[PDB]
Write a protein that binds this ligand. Structure first.
Ligand code: MG
Ligand code: MG
Lengths: 133, 229, 51, 88, 52, 51
RNA sequence: AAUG
RNA sequence: AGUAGUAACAAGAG
RNA sequence: ACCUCUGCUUCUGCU
């Protein structure tokens, strides 16, 4: 959807200085530490095996209720649901050459954004934040 | 003090108490105090939950294959928290932060037991310092002084048997001069232990550079001298 | 063969654990040519780690 | 349907390691019952020093109890389940 | 700038130097960790190559 | 692990790496080691055949 | 500014 | 033969 | 046995 509802601009040729920075690859629903996100996934999918309750259940109660509403009556096996929930909660942060934009909606199109000698003006779909603005 | 525990409790209670100590990284052969405390705790939790039963209509009786209480204390930590998560998620009662010792299917409440030696109301309020109104309470002591919870349903047959067992345990501890071992604390650190055997010590001795006879000479030469220049 | 050739000027002995023939080049003699030598000096390594 | 897996290399059927086939399929059955009882075992690593039979027997006993306390079993099939668990 | 390669790197090192390194690095550690970190150079200084 | 069980070496049941490495370096002091290996036993089948 |  | 290159294949096993 | 298995499945010892 962020690809489809996007618009493209001019392409310019000229020098580009890329700086290798540690950026977030894909945008997230909510950025959590991996053990806290594992506790969230165990509360969403396998609630009778979550073990000792943390304090993360009270912070993330609306996310758990929403994600239990959305995955209501599906027949997809829970290992795939856990893989996709871990895909949309746990961050992937890697070192990439970045010139210009480093938000995750631009890092997911960094291959077609700019190169070493060209730049492409691009604006993704969705809605941009306020801290990034 | 271990033949006391060997003759006074069944093998199941002793094995469960030893595994309970081993889960918290302790040693049962070197601490009979904590082993005795967990054996007394499990014996109380099993005598209370001995023969209370709900029938197909759900009426309790003390004399079926569905008991009134489910024992959480005694099982391994992952299994006991599985039982607590399941019983909290099924009946709708909110999951407590800590691990209760029994579950009552009639009141449908988590019943936590404590064991003290002084004022039962004192240990009652010591538990209420950290619990709140999330569990029930069954506090007992060795001198016929109990303190049950304000929404309790404990009868007086098991209340006779529990205090009779506690007083008989106290009398047999004092008869063989063993209460003095339980007054004092058997405190030692269960630090990480790693003993080098015979072959690996010989291999480490012969695996030193040229100029050293054993390994401790090389180790103290590394630690002591200053090789500057 | 190449491992024992580059360290044959060290201390040879027979192990009293397994029985095999062991060679010790560490704190052996200093080299005299540009052959690959495995005679590492212990004080030089300890001075490097201390720096 | 394009996430298939290739077949196992069957060169071991002629060597001296054919018992390691059976020795694998004795393991797998046990694990394929364990993830039946503990569904989170594929996502979470199971922790514990107790046996693999004790954990499964306790999980099956609690499942049968919370089945009979919700009407999802009979009064007779509950007796069959608890008799089998009394054997185990 | 020297563009360099190291010849005979695996044959000319020593487990007896790595033992001294694991005794120098773990100076201020407990004794059990110093006995743990000084077993891999011991098993590597007495290794036996199977030929093939 | 299944061969260490036959020698009263049980650092794998406790679940940590440190008791397992303790049993590893204590198996070097064991005078004998028992393990599971595989031999072969031959068998005659009569038929209508040659040789 | 980060999130190992 | 040939591929190949410090040692193999040019079918192996029952 | 013009029968069967195999195509990355490792050979210390049964040899
Ligand atoms: Mg408890
Ligand atoms: Mg280079």
């Amino acid at each position: 959807m962020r690809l489809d509802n996007a618009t493209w601009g001019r392409i310019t040729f000229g020098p580009v200085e890329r700086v290798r920075k540690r950026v977030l690859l894909n945008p997230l629903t909510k950025e959590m530490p991996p053990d806290e996100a594992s506790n969230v996934i165990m509360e969403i999918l396998f609630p009778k095996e979550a073990g000792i309750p943390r304090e993360s259940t009270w912070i993330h109660r609306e996310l758990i209720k929403e994600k239990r509403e959305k995955l209501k009556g599906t027949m997809i096996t829970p290992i795939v649901l856990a893989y996709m929930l871990e895909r949309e909660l746990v961050a992937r942060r890697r070192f990439l050459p970045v010139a210009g934009a480093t938000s995750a909606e631009f890092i997911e199109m960094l291959h077609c954004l700019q190169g070493e000698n060209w730049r492409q003006i691009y604006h993704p779909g969705g809605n941009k934040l306020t801290e990034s603005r | 003090m271990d033949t006391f525990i060997t003759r006074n409790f069944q093998t199941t209670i002793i094995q469960k108490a030893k595994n309970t100590m081993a889960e918290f990284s302790e040693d049962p052969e070197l601490q009979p105090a904590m082993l005795f405390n967990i054996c007394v705790h499990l014996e109380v939790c099993y005598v209370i939950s001995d023969m209370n039963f709900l029938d197909e209509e759900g009426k309790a009786y003390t004399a079926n294959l569905r008991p009134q209480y489910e024992v959480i204390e005694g099982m391994p930590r992952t299994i006991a928290w599985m039982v607590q998560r399941s019983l909290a998620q099924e009946h709708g009662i909110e999951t407590p932060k800590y691990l209760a010792d029994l579950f009552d299917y009639k009141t449908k409440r988590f019943i936590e037991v404590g064991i003290t030696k002084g004022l039962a109301d004192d240990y009652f309020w010591k538990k209420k310092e950290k619990l709140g109104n999330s569990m029930e309470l069954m506090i007992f002591s060795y001198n016929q002084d109990y303190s049950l919870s304000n929404e309790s349903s404990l009868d007086e047959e098991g209340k006779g048997r529990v205090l009779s067992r506690l007083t008989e345990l106290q009398a047999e501890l004092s008869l063989k001069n063993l209460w003095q071992v339980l007054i004092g604390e058997e405190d030692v650190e269960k630090g990480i232990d790693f003993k080098l055997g015979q072959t690996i010590s010989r291999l480490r001795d012969i695996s030193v550079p040229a100029g050293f006879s054993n390994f401790e000479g090389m180790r103290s030469y590394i630690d002591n001298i200053d090789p500057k220049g | 063969i190449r491992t024992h050739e580059y360290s044959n000027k060290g201390k040879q002995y027979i192990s009293d654990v397994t029985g095999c023939t062991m060679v010790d080049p560490t704190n052996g003699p200093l080299p005299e040519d540009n052959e690959p030598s495995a005679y590492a000096q212990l004080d030089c390594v300890l001075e490097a780690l201390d720096r | 349907t394009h996430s298939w897996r290739t077949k196992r290399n069957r060169s071991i059927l002629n060597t001296d390691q054919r018992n390691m086939i059976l020795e694998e399929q004795c393991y797998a059955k046990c694990c394929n019952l364990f993830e039946a009882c503990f569904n989170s075992a594929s996502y979470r690593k199971p922790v514990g020093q107790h046996s693999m039979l004790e954990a499964m027997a306790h999980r099956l006993r609690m499942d049968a109890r919370l089945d009979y306390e919700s009407g999802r079993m009979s009064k007779d099939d509950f007796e069959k389940a608890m008799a089998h668990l009394g054997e185990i | 700038t020297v563009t360099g390669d190291n010849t005979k790197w695996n044959e000319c090192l020593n487990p007896r130097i790595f033992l001294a390194m694991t005794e120098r690095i773990t100076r201020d550690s407990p004794i059990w960790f110093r006995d743990f970190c000084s077993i891999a150079p011991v098993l590597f200084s007495n290794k036996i190559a199977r030929l093939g | 692990i299944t061969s260490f069980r036959l020698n009263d070496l049980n650092g794998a049941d406790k679940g940590g790496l440190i008791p397992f490495c303790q049993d590893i370096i204590d198996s070097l002091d064991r005078p004998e080691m028992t393990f599971f290996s595989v031999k072969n036993i031959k068998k005659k089948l009569p038929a209508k055949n040659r040789k």
